[PDB]
Amino acid sequence: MTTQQLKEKISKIIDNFSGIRVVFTTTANELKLSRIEGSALNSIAEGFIDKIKEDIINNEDLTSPLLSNFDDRKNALFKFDYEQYPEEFNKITQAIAIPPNSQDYYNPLNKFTDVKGIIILISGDNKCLALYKNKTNLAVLRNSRKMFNLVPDPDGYLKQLPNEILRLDFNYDLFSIGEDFYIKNHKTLETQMKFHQVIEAQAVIALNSLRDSLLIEDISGLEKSSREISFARKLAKISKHSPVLGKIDTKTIIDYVSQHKYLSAILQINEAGDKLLIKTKTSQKHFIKLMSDDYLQSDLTKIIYMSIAKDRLDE
Template sequence: MIKTELVTLLKESLLNEELITAELYFILKQDQVTLLRFIDIEGETQEDLTKQFIEKVKSELIEDDSLDLISISNADDRNKVLYEYDLDEVPEEIKLINTILKDEDIPSFDFRTDELAQIKGIIVLMSNNNHNLLLYKKHYPVSLIRKDNTFTFKRIGDHKRFVSVEEDIVRINTNFEFLMIDDSLIIKELATLEKFFGFHEIIKKKAQECIIAIEQSGLLEDADVLKELIDEISYSRKLTKVLNSSPVLNKIPTPSVIAFTNIYPALKGQFQYNADNSKIVLSTKKSKHLFAKLLNDDFLQSELTKMFYDSLAKDNIPETVTS
């Protein structure tokens, strides 16, 4: 999917927005079991929430032209980007998103059996115009105001008197980290995915697969040295990108790759080689990082100025034929 296709889907899902009602669900953790609970919300409050979530989608996704959309297997260090999830393994908690669309008998949150302290996430569902738009919010402990020995006050109507709030209070804002539109899972906050959902372990598995592919290519004297950096999430992402879409690995002959490392300014003198110069030897951390960038074809030269560049983001430009 490209960004314009995503925007089109979102616009279609929000057509006649006055007819949309947002349904909210809590994700609870009870005795190591993850559960879904429907949130029964008073009508006027639900209308206000719906309007605010719609405006959030519009402002942060539809109207933000600066956002790119790339696959998560091609993730790099860009800031203004959305990621379409294209890996086989999906974190368990995120799989619950699909449950909402399949199960019509999700029980309601019940204060007799459920606790606000058990909330781990919130899902917002807006179904409209034959599209299902789901927003996922990570719930943080600071969003729960617990009743303790301090006092939280609220007013009574328009009068001058305050009364103490005697219950726990949960706060919900309109920020969200992931969304699902129909069958496409889009990651808005990659850091949240990496920190709370075991995504690093998924990426590490892909990075390990990449190291095996590099070893089989015969490009390195010893590919195992790359394992020393596999716990670095940014490096594992680079290897995942190599595995998914490297224009170099197993596509450019090894002699040509080695020759390039000897003439490109940023690479010259950074690598060592075996006795007959047929394989690259990575002996420093810097060389390992440069090698990952080499396989991702990050080192470019301008056709116009002949200047050399280290390019993080490379979007393909389609060739056009003009008459």
């Protein structure tokens, strides 16, 4: 889905604003609609409208690539590509169709520790915009603690209320429109809704194809360093979106490393020359950056550029 159609759909939701309901997500995976006060709900509504307007509506550098081509660019909303949906996405798609006459209602005597996620339903133009945010560990507030019961205090230690904070801000983690899911914070996706196993599965199928490529004598270094997600995400991108894997033969790759004036020095070639000699961590990182085609040049300046967050032009 193009970014312009995304902006048009969100704008058609935005100026045709109708209503907003807040429903929690539980540890036992049931909907529990809340009792937000009307002035407070309106304040959160206009704040969320301003935040989503600043993020999406008037933003000019917005890009929406697939999650499989994950990069480290800012102010972008990645599109979900995997058909395997974790259970929170099914919870979102249930929460966009909860009837208002239902009485499956929240009990606030549960110390607010049962809730593990806040859903913001921006409803309008007979459509729903479901914005989910994590619990974000009840980030610490600050009171102005008094003595006895006399409320002002010229000198007093400022402390924290224990668990009635419910810090939900105006930021969001990921939002869904229609049937396509969009994310903003990939860290809570990777660490909360059971995604790391999928990332290591893509990492080990990438490592299987890499050992089928016959390029490294020390593949044990990659499988001993690949349990971190900071390498496993790049391995998943190598597995699914790479113009090197299964596309370019080994001899052209070794000729490119032999002819390049940087990669011949930082990354050591094998003495036999049939394979590539990587052992160290920086050699691993430069190897990963090379095989994702992050080393580029122009025709004007003819300087070799290393790209952090590249983007295709032909598609």
